[PDB]
């Protein structure tokens, strides 16, 4: 059955696997290690953009505000921000770069505007997420040390938080649509879930990678004629190489989505 398939993939990986598939209309789920902690890595950028939009909703932030910065602020993996030292970038451009190209300096600039990792965590508490925590900046938050609860979530919490943000009322309708639009425009990690879906299925997603053999993805998927589903998949402490880790996430995603929809 499914749990046996996942345990076998987990043992082939040498690591820990966590998954939630959640029906946003019914709350029905497939869960595997749903109550354990895993590192968020770049999937936190989805929550960061949500927090920014919530500040916009409240009149405390402006998507057109231009932020300036220097070459000395750039960290690893900053493909967009490294091009705009001279002219700056708007909050919206930074949100877009952070989600769609996983730009790390863009995430750090938005985190700074919010007030830091503690301010993002306080936002998540404010919307009912008691578990998820951000402690560090990019790229240190990708360390994924075993047993380290910094910068982690639980799959069940991430999925429920995404349900609240994308289909609840924590954000205005306009901010909700903007957040979906950025996730739909994501350009990295397409091997992990998008490659496996029919072309008429809608998907917004954000992937992450880290040390200690870690890889993950979060997604909102709209099947035709169906309520959207939230998929969150984690792998950490894995012992296989980067390509095998991608393949593990992809096969988990194939199995769990099929199992969820073949609920007959």
Author numbering: 28 to 58, 60 to 238, 240 to 252, 254 to 294
Article, verbatim:
TEM-1 β-lactamase degrades β-lactam antibiotics with a strong preference for penicillins. Sequence reconstruction studies indicate that it evolved from ancestral enzymes that degraded a variety of β-lactam antibiotics with moderate efficiency. This generalist to specialist conversion involved more than 100 mutational changes, but conserved fold and catalytic residues, suggesting a role for dynamics in enzyme evolution. The resurrected Precambrian β-lactamases were found to degrade both penicillin and third-generation antibiotics (such as CTX) with moderate catalytic efficiency.
By deliberately weighting and altering the conformational dynamics of a putative Precambrian β-lactamase, we engineer enzyme specificity that mimics the modern TEM-1 β-lactamase with only 21 amino acid replacements. In an effort to further validate the hinge-shift mechanism, we have engineered the minimum number of necessary substitutions in the ancestral GNCA β-lactamase, such that the designed mutant is closer, in its activity, to that of the specialist extant TEM-1 β-lactamase. We propose a detailed mechanism, according to which selected substitution mutations are applied to GNCA, which gradually drives its dynamics (DFI profile) towards that of TEM-1 β-lactamase. Indeed, we observed that mutations in sets X and Y, when combined together, bring the dynamics of GNCA closer to TEM-1 β- lactamase. Adding substitutions in set Z with the previous substitutions (set XYZ), we managed to shift the DFI profile of the engineered mutant towards that of TEM-1 β-lactamase beyond what was accomplished by the XY substitutions alone. The comparison of the flexibility profiles of the GNCA mutant with mutations from set XY and set Z together and the wild-type GNCA and TEM-1 β-lactamases show that the mutant successfully recapitulates the dynamics of TEM-1 β-lactamase. We observe that, as expected, the mutant GNCA-XYZ lies very close to the wild-type TEM-1 β-lactamase, which is an improvement over mutants with mutations from sets X and XY, suggesting that the ancestral variant GNCA-XYZ with merely 21 substitutions should degrade only penicillin with better efficiency than GNCA β-lactamase, mimicking the catalytic activity of TEM-1 β-lactamase. Therefore, using these 21 substitutions, we are able to dynamically replicate the effect of a total of 119 substitutions observed between GNCA and TEM-1 β-lactamase.
